[PDB]
Design a protein around this ligand. Sequence first.
Ligand code: NAG
Ligand code: NAG
Ligand code: CL
Length: 333
Amino acid sequence: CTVKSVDDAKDIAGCSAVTLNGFTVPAGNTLVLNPDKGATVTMAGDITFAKTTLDGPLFTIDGTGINFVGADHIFDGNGALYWDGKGTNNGTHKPHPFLKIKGSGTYKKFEVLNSPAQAISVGPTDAHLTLDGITVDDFAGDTKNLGHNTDGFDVSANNVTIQNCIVKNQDDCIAINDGNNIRFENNQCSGGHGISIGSIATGKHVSNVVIKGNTVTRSMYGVRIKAQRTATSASVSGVTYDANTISGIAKYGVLISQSYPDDVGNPGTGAPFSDVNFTGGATTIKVNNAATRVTVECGNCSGNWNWSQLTVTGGKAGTIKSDKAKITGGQYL
Ligand SMILES: *[C@@H]1O[C@H](CO)[C@@H](O)[C@H](O)[C@H]1NC(C)=O
Ligand SMILES: *[C@@H]1O[C@H](CO)[C@@H](O)[C@H](O)[C@H]1NC(C)=O
Ligand SMILES: [Cl-]
């Protein structure tokens, strides 16, 4: 029941207490864990991934009711051996995502250090999945702006809570791409692109999202909801921003747009956004001198968007094109 190598990992059936020792995952290998229902998996060392040509994920764990106890250990992706400023858009191959977590349970207190590109992919789930006290430290990717597409958490899943986490990166802190009942609470995001829903693609539906109690600093955006201009059979419905403290924003405090990859222009109509609120505790957002406070670019949006608890200051005014939705502010114009 102690995993000391990629080959030991296949031999954990029957264990309710698995110890994951530190080792290197060699080039051309992946680390896959399929623990018994309800097993506790405890990390006892750091796992380093040698430079590899494989596609990600390089680590996959899938189980039901897993209790993952990180004990502050590290999954080291050696990202600086890949980073070239182009991420997964072009350039060198980037194994991505680095980690994949599927099923259900509670994952606590480990660090992903220097992912090649996107760090932690979440989903699908079979019951509630909680990620608590995880650090994605891709800060080294800031040097010469070489880190790219270093998303902290990419979520396509139902019934997820991500709380008490820290992300230092160059792209979305979280990107919620599909699923219902997703909570992102009491996290700290810096360096990247803020807290995102999307990009929403054809056939994807995000609903019942709570973004509460987070701090965002030194980022390109505060919060974003992005849908591909071309997406159809898609939606975002029921989003609540509550008690977020955001500052140091370079481009947009809030950008809600159906023009992606463009910020504005000819917004799409096939990925309707509805019921987007800033309520509960104040969400305060301070933007830089050249930044825009709030832009909403809707081709198809609906509902009574209560933005009473939003305050955005700094920078310049954006534009509001909310389609059928009625936005009741708040201070940001
Ligand atoms: C990748 O970069 C090359 C230029 O070096 C360009 O010709 C190609 O079309 C680019 N592709 C993407 C997908 O960005
Ligand atoms: C998981 O989400 C699915 C769809 O949201 C819902 O039907 C189900 O009740 C949720 N399960 C749990 C355990 O929350
Ligand atoms: Cl290889």
